[PDB]
Write a protein that binds this ligand. Structure first.
Ligand SMILES: Cc1cc2nc3c(=O)[nH]c(=O)nc-3n(C[C@H](O)[C@H](O)[C@H](O)COP(=O)(O)OP(=O)(O)OC[C@H]3O[C@@H](n4cnc5c(N)ncnc54)[C@H](O)[C@@H]3O)c2cc1C
Ligand SMILES: Cc1cc2nc3c(=O)[nH]c(=O)nc-3n(C[C@H](O)[C@H](O)[C@H](O)COP(=O)(O)OP(=O)(O)OC[C@H]3O[C@@H](n4cnc5c(N)ncnc54)[C@H](O)[C@@H]3O)c2cc1C
Lengths: 448, 448
């Protein structure tokens, strides 16, 4: 029968976070996980991507900047197997830390595929498991568009699975994963082509910032192809050929689908428990992460409020504070969540885009500040790399409702500004703060 | 007799920023400069140092991290002359950019040593220049101690003057310039020793962060010598020998004094204007930058409130707003200024140290949050580089009165938090802000 106070279906960012903090306040917890522990982020997401990004930044330095700083090489050889071995070694050590936290806080790891039997019970390898509280944190999977020959194209999971880098690659998609992988593989020397469906990449991100990314792709000869709707994929002697709606076609060794991600909802027997989906296909929940069935909760990518790791972690930790530390009205705040996209160079954003702020406050009520400049790092070399910053203010007092940036060092500067912006910072609060020179971050506090 | 609404004695950070903003509001302004336009920051300070720091960061990247990211070379070859040429080309262009900003704002560039005649007149090369408003922004000079043979040792000016790197150098000092130069030159393969007079470098920075720097110096074999009081310098056949009070001695090709910087107050005929000095040797001014004489002002390093480039720039711009834009009470806020030391790795700080917080608020009203870790960048490699973060809170509300960091990326993460801390951010405001994963900056918002 198996007795636990609370269980988590899924051992990813959300599941680990919720059960550790539940166990921290003296609850009997259990995590149920199909694949490896740690979920998408540890195994096939944030961690391996960022390690490969750092590798690409070194390749960039060697090839682009080194000569004009007085460094010249003789036989600069890149061994990807060496990077991959050390990438996976770091993931192995990070995955073991999570096992140590389970055992310390009194959380049982149960390897297997969970499946609802009734509203308080789940089935794992035949054996039933019962609990008053059940957290569905099953995460997400890559979206494969329904067209002929789509199975021939791989996904982000296949990119980290690669033991050697292919000759060429064709990336289909316009989101953050597409731009990240395109930048990394291009810098490593793979014949990388990116195909977006309409207009430009990152249509949710601010245009001024994305325009800076497009300019950087032109300058590094990373071919971007706009208005490319894929109709069909097909096998050839060269590899895989893509057929587009406009008329043209293109061929490469590998083809990667990176259009979006959809929630894991289908293999759970949600009708037996009584758990309903919302209209968009995510698990329906309220502001406190409660499903329609009491005693069952959902959070992380499966609920789809904001598909990020620390969103799942805080949502998870906040839920366990509510259930086991008496914080009755405690809930996740989904506004003003900062994001960084590790493109070449990195994009950073928090708050509203210009178009979001117009709909929210009114067209007349929004002011905008822009700053184009080159960083000192790149600007004293052949390869001048443009940075672009933007601040969006609202009201008579000019409340900073959006901050956006692309450039060297942007990845590390957003966190502090996110704290300021969530407190209700005005333009006057920014301008009163003295600059740190010489940095790129000082541009945000000296805009006119 | 040439006449102006306002003039600046000195064409550095303070002087240029004051006259450009004065000219922006229609006042006929002029900048008077002895040596090179741009001042200490552009020609022999922030700019050449940061370019050399970036050069050193590339050297660190290839030697310590390259191999484990899959990069190897038959021979890595460094040529300082190429770095210096491009460094000075960037400085040539930055210096040329001021000529464009002068033509827009209507600012005349006068060249020569200025010198007071009376309270409203100066002399440059015999020609008398009268003005209603005179701004003293003469800056500072490297301090050379008074001991036998002190002339044999140079300063930071001489480090940037170098066409070739010497074989060995001895840096005598404990401040930010000593630590910055010691790190850069050590990374470029110069036999570099750092000699501090007392217990540790960087008195006034937080012990936890400084302890982290000392640990990195010892790990990378950059000798730090403590309790080393120079009594004498002596020219020898070996090189230049330093004799210390403890009876030991040390020899090197060059010796660099980095003991501190003093204001330029002696060449101006300040007695003829009626401008006085305070007990510390700086020009005496009030909170509005007014001297004891009407229509004469002083700002930047010569007044010594906080010796940084953006402090001189903001104070100067605030002064011109007061005089030429009807904002009679406008003044420079000198409290809670953020600072970054470009050591290896970079140190960043805003607000109070732990000692300072205890002295202000008392021992039992202060909570301290610490965090020691290795960045993901270095954690994949042989050479695990340690980062150290520290928050200091005060009172029942836990107002963040200090933030400190040392580690990869710290240089760019401070600016945002400085805005937040200046607004009166609490620990609750930090903990409410969602983390950006995977970064180093997220550690500040997840401390427990
Ligand atoms: C390439 C890539 C890069 C990314 N980079 C970033 C980044 O830089 N920053 C960032 O914040 N986010 C990033 N993300 C998103 C981030 O990985 C997710 O938001 C996060 O992993 C969500 O955590 P979760 O717990 O909701 O789901 P997951 O971490 O995916 O965990 C779900 C787990 O549950 C298991 N599971 C599913 N169904 C069952 C079942 N029936 N029984 C038992 N177990 C089950 C799965 O095997 C899986 O391990 C990235 C994603 C990808 C694909
Ligand atoms: C090695 C080094 C590194 C530094 N790094 C940093 C850093 O990273 N960040 C930072 O914020 N700050 C840094 N500083 C400090 C910064 O450079 C100064 O605080 C800043 O330049 C001060 O500006 P100022 O206008 O007060 O004086 P300055 O910029 O020094 O300008 C004074 C000018 O006045 C001229 N002058 C003097 N007397 C006369 C006269 N009688 N007539 C005409 N002209 C005259 C001088 O020639 C000089 O050009 C650094 C300093 C040094 C030495």
């Amino acid at each position: 029968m198996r007795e636990y106070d609370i269980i988590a279906i899924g051992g990813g960012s959300g599941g680990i976070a919720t059960m550790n903090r539940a166990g921290e306040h003296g609850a009997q917890a259990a995590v149920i996980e199909e694949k490896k522990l740690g979920g998408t982020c540890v195994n096939v997401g944030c961690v391996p991507k960022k390690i490969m990004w750092y590798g690409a930044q070194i390749a960039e330095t060697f090839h682009q900047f080194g000569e004009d700083y007085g460094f010249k090489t003789t036989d600069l050889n890149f061994d990807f197997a060496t990077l991959r071995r050390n990438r996976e070694s770091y993931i192995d050590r990070a995955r073991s830390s999570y096992d140590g936290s389970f055992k310390r806080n009194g959380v049982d790891l149960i390897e297997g595929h969970a499946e609802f039997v009734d509203s308080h019970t789940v089935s794992v390898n035949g054996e039933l498991i019962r609990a008053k509280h059940i957290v569905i944190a099953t995460g997400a999977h890559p979206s494969i568009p329904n067209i002929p020959g789509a199975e021939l194209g791989g996904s982000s999971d296949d990119v980290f699975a690669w033991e050697e880098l292919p000759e060429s690659v064709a990336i289909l998609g316009a989101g953050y994963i597409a731009v990240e992988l395109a930048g990394v593989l291009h810098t490593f020397g793979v014949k990388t082509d990116l195909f977006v469906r309409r207009d430009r990449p990152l249509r949710g991100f601010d245009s001024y910032i994305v325009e800076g990314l497009v300019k950087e792709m032109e300058r590094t000869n990373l071919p971007l192809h706009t208005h490319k709707v894929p109709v069909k994929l097909e096998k050839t002697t060269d590899g895989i050929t893509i057929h587009f709606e406009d008329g043209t076609s293109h061929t490469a060794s590998q083809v990667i689908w990176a259009t979006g991600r959809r929630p894991n909802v289908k293999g759970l027997q949600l009708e037996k428990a009584g758990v309903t989906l919302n209209e968009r296909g995510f698990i329906q929940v309220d502001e406190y992460q409660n499903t329609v069935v009491e005693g069952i909760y959902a959070l992380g990518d499966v609920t789809g409020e904001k598909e990020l790791t620390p969103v799942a972690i805080k949502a998870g930790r906040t839920l366990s504070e509510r259930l086991f530390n008496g914080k009755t009205t405690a809930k996740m705040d989904y506004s003003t969540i900062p994001t960084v996209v590790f493109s070449h160079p990195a994009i950073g954003t928090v708050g509203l885009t210009e178009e979001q702020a117009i709909k929210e406050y009114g067209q007349d009520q929004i002011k905008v500040y822009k700053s184009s400049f080159a960083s000192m790092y790149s600007a004293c070399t052949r390869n001048r790399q443009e940075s672009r910053f933007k601040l969006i203010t609202a009201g008579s007092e000019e409340k900073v409702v959006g901050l956006h940036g692309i450039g060297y060092g942007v990845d590390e500067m957003i966190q502090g500004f996110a704290v300021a912006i969530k407190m209700g910072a005005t333009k006057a609060d920014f301008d009163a703060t003295v600059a740190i020179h010489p940095t790129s971050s000082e541009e945000f506090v000296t805009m006119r």
